[PDB]
Design a protein around this ligand. Structure first.
Ligand SMILES: [Mg+2]
Ligand SMILES: [Mg+2]
Ligand SMILES: [Mg+2]
Ligand SMILES: [Mg+2]
Ligand SMILES: [Mg+2]
Ligand SMILES: [Mg+2]
Ligand SMILES: [Mg+2]
Ligand SMILES: [Mg+2]
Ligand SMILES: [Mg+2]
Ligand SMILES: [Mg+2]
Ligand SMILES: [Zn+2]
Lengths: 114, 82, 66, 177, 101
RNA sequence: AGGGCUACACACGUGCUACAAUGGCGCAUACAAAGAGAAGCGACCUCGCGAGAGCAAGCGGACCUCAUAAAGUGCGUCGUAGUCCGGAUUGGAGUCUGCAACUCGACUCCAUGAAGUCGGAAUCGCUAGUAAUCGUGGAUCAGAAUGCCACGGUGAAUACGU
């Protein structure tokens, strides 16, 4: 219950707990538990330390919180040093992939100012 | 994005200009209108000026901007603020 | 030097992508694996006489159809 | 140590043959390297100074001297005695270690690096560079940096004039665009 | 339709059906994995792109054959909604009637 | 030729998606109708987690294809949580159309997992196969719908009265 540097909760099923890892959603969790051979109906409570350790090194076979943060933040910073369209949107705080900003841009602009 | 089975894209006129520029071009920027051409590693070191709609904004090509096209670096909608 | 006020300053190995590995007593916390260095930089030794292992190859050179 | 040995043998020999000196000490030595962070936003967030101090501590393994306001400047809204900066001086083995770290790691990692400015001497041979991104230093993790601040760096040299200082630095293979 | 747009569509039909059988074989050359990507595909891309843009069938707007109206077109009747309603209600279109089900 | 109609401190209209358990998720299995097809629908088989790709028969169509309907029913899990609800943002890697998908298409895979806890004044639809919901087809269409026009599956409540 100490994978990747977080304190992943017990009493939750196998997949439902590994979702908390920043970089492991439902599918990658199912892939980890598949490579580890553990059934998906069992909790994270009654798993022994060695099983937790092989889960740890399988998570380490994938990207983890700190590393993922590093590549995505360097991708955003590469956008902003290019001074490209995506850089201007990320800087200015506007939609990047081309959505409409006249209306329905709240999730990338914050709540309404005036 | 463009499929891999068709490869990248570059206009032929611009392509000819880019080899002429990287073989004997040291005089003036390259005034092009093809915003749709993906940057190649051949053009590295050029100061091509791509058409943003009314003029041509120069952009010095850097080796860390690879899978982007010339229209990502030309702004099309000027907006100071409200 | 003083005591119990400065950080940890152990001996660290730094390995770049071109095979240049440097022993340096530094303050990082763990091993380092960097990419560029003096030996593998364009300006330092030949602007068009260096190779890279980044945006010019991985993302692009694998996919080109020229 | 290693770069100090490289100095003691190769740089001293090449300077000896190039400058035709009568004394070994007549070649430029190096006094120190002062890493400076003129924070200047401490007036709003006092904590931003402690983060800069932690950042200098990260870059070089020394606690920083919290530098004080030299005099009161109403334009910048600073009084006498308000802590608006932090610095560290590295001289000796630590100077050489950090110096190697910089020249071999950080100077290539500069953003759009087109060489180093060849006019940064006071007029007697003391070099002074300003980096615009702290990220070039390897020590940085980038996972605990609120703001990507920059810093300057002064290589204090015992050179007599700008030519001798440039000669000493160029011997260490600086880009010098 | 300003008469100019009609003439444009005429020249587009002409260049499309004349430069046809060339754009199509270039597309076939691009689409097939078996042909070498290295040189044949890249040169086929270049030859395809240097072919005049008007010769593509993706520039057909399918205007009305009489009044050139770009919008409201129907492929079945070949006419704008207005001309469809007038000619269909007068009775020159066979088997057509006001439906009610 | 490029750009803009997609611009964004904002406000309004019309929709979609939710706030959850009458639900989400995996597995098993049912029941439609109406349409569209040849510079088109495109079996099968194989490859790829998937979008889709190669090969390619049949069909000018009560014959072939689109096309496996879904909600439902059974089995488990979640246990009232901002959560296994939500999928908005954002990064990376792609597929397809098209010369070309950056401004400015749609999907797919991985990760990121916000606001949102049933909504004030006010205001809209509906008297029955209707409202409410579930899914499918068309036109436009090179590609690009949550819109429009059609088709079926479950299927209410209430109408004292003016
Ligand atoms: Mg997760
Ligand atoms: Mg069209
Ligand atoms: Mg017309
Ligand atoms: Mg609009
Ligand atoms: Mg939904
Ligand atoms: Mg039919
Ligand atoms: Mg939340
Ligand atoms: Mg969420
Ligand atoms: Mg009625
Ligand atoms: Mg009743
Ligand atoms: Zn190297």
């Amino acid at each position: 219950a100490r994978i990747a540097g977080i304190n992943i909760p017990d009493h939750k099923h196998a997949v439902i707990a590994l979702t908390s890892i920043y970089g492991v959603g439902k599918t990658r969790s199912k892939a980890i538990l598949a490579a580890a051979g553990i059934a998906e109906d069992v909790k994270i409570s009654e798993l022994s330390e060695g099983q937790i350790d092989t889960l740890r090194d399988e998570v380490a076979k994938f990207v983890v919180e700190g590393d993922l943060r590093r590549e995505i933040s360097m991708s955003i910073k590469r956008l902003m040093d290019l001074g490209c369209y995506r850089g201007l949107r990320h800087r200015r705080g506007l939609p990047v992939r081309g959505q409409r900003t006249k209306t329905n841009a709240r999730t990338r602009k914050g709540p309404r100012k005036p | 994005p463009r499929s891999l089975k068709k490869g990248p894209f570059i206009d032929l006129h611009l392509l000819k200009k880019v080899e002429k520029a990287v073989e004997s071009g040291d005089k003036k920027p390259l005034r092009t209108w093809s915003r749709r051409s993906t940057i190649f590693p051949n053009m590295i070191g050029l100061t091509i000026a791509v058409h943003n709609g009314r003029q041509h904004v120069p952009v010095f090509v850097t080796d860390e901007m690879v899978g982007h096209k010339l229209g990502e670096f030309a702004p099309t909608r000027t907006y100071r603020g409200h | 030097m003083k005591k119990d006020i400065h950080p940890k300053y152990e001996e660290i190995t730094a390995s770049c992508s071109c095979g240049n590995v440097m022993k340096i007593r530094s303050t990082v916390g763990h091993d380092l694996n960097l990419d560029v260095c003096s030996k593998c930089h364009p300006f330092f030794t030949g602007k068009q006489r260096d190779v890279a292992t980044g945006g010019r190859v991985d993302r692009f050179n694998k996919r080109f159809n020229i | 140590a290693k770069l100090h040995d490289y100095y003691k043998d190769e740089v001293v020999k090449k300077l000896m043959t190039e400058f035709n000196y009568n004394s070994v000490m007549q070649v430029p030595r190096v006094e120190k390297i002062t890493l400076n962070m003129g924070v200047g936003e401490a007036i709003a967030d006092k904590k931003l100074l402690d983060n800069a101090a932690a950042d200098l501590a990260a870059i070089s393994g020394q606690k920083p001297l919290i530098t004080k306001a030299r005099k009161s400047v109403a334009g910048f809204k600073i009084r006498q005695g308000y802590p608006i900066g932090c610095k560290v001086t590295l001289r000796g083995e630590r100077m050489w270690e950090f110096f190697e770290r910089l020249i071999t790691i950080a100077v290539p990692r500069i953003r759009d690096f087109r060489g180093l400015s060849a006019k940064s001497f006071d007029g007697r041979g003391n070099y002074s560079m300003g980096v615009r991104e702290q990220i070039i230093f390897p020590e940085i993790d980038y996972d605990k940096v609120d703001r990507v601040r920059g810093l300057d760096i002064t290589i204090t040299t015992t050179a007599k004039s700008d030519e001798e200082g440039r000669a000493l630095l160029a011997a260490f293979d600086f880009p010098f665009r | 339709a300003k008469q100019s747009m009609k003439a444009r569509e005429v020249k587009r039909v002409a260049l499309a059906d004349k430069y046809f059988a060339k754009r199509a074989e270039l597309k076939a050359i691009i689409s097939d994995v078996n042909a070498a990507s290295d040189e044949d595909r890249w040169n086929a891309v270049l030859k395809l792109q240097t072919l005049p843009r008007d010769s593509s069938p993706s520039r057909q707007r399918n205007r009305c054959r009489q009044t050139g109206r770009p919008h409201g077109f129907l492929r079945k009747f070949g006419l704008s909604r207005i001309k469809v309603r007038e000619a269909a209600m007068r009775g020159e279109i066979p088997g057509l009637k006001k439906a009610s089900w």
